[PDB]
Design a protein around this ligand. Structure first.
Ligand SMILES: NS(=O)(=O)c1ccc2c(c1)[C@H]1CCC[C@H]1[C@@H](c1ccccc1Cl)N2
Ligand SMILES: [Zn+2]
Length: 257
């Protein structure tokens, strides 16, 4: 009876195995745009993905992860609110059963159709497993998806999903360029938070871009054909794999006016 997104094992249950679910810096949150304060001392984000090395795509039973070689500084995030160098390890998405829901963060209570998370770890901690034990261990770049025009740089991901339909399936996924998933503007909000799934560790500097990317209805429909279940188990569509907004408790900063 492990955690998931169902009635009996979803977000309102997670605190029984993971008491930090009720902690002081949980994610996601609602971004109240009028309450966020412009921080003129915040630096532009530096997103250096030209040497990114994608390896594989995995259905882990909760989402699909596109994994990268993080054994050298090859795709890194720096600047913004960050001190030092954060290495890209993987990206994944959260999405809805309907276009009106799916994002984890919300903007003035607005839900987007989906949310992309580019996960990076602070190289001063040596490995990802050490970094998640630290309050400044991770930097997650969050990008909203709205339904409209197709995102051409997403299509190579959409077209491989048939090969990883079920939990535990993986496929080779080399030479994927994550620059094709980035909006024009790097204007962002930032706050200290957590992983949005168990183990819900409070190790994340969240950086959430203001400008969404557009994807087509056909692209997100293909996300919704994935399965939470393993092969030869009853089919349960992988939809609504998002945690709702958590209390802000004790400030969201904006990079822009
Ligand atoms: N929705 S998200 O971007 O906040 C998110 C949620 C859960 C997980 C991740 C990212 C990645 C990033 C940090 C930990 C790692 C993962 C995990 C896997 C292997 C080993 C340890 C851990 Cl903690 N769990
Ligand atoms: Zn995520």
């Amino acid at each position: 009876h492990h955690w998931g997104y169902g009635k009996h094992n979803g977000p309102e249950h997670w605190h029984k195995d993971f008491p930090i679910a009720k902690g002081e810096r949980q994610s996601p949150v609602d971004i109240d745009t009028h309450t966020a304060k412009y921080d003129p001392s915040l630096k532009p984000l530096s997103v250096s993905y030209d040497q990114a090395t994608s390896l594989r795509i995995l259905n882990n039973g909760h989402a699909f992860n596109v994994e990268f070689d993080d054994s050298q500084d090859k795709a890194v995030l720096k600047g913004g609110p960050l001190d030092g160098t954060y290495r890209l390890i993987q990206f994944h998405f959260h999405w809805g059963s309907l276009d009106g829901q799916g994002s984890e963060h919300t903007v003035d209570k607005k839900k987007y159709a989906a949310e992309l998370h580019l996960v990076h770890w602070n190289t001063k901690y040596g490995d990802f497993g050490k970094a998640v034990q630290q309050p400044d261990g991770l930097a997650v770049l969050g990008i909203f998806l709205k339904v409209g025009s197709a995102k051409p740089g997403l299509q190579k991901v959409v077209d491989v999903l048939d090969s990883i339909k079920t939990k535990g399936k993986s496929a080779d996924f080399t030479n994927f360029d994550p620059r094709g998933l980035l909006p024009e503007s790097l204007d962002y909000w930032t706050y200290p938070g957590s992983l949005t799934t168990p183990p819900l560790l409070e190790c994340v500097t969240w950086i959430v871009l203001k400008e969404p990317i557009s994807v087509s209805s056909e692209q997100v429909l293909k996300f919704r054909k994935l399965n939470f279940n393993g092969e030869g188990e009853p089919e349960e569509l992988m939809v609504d794999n998002w945690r709702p907004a958590q209390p802000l408790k004790n400030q969201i900063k904006a990079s822009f006016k």
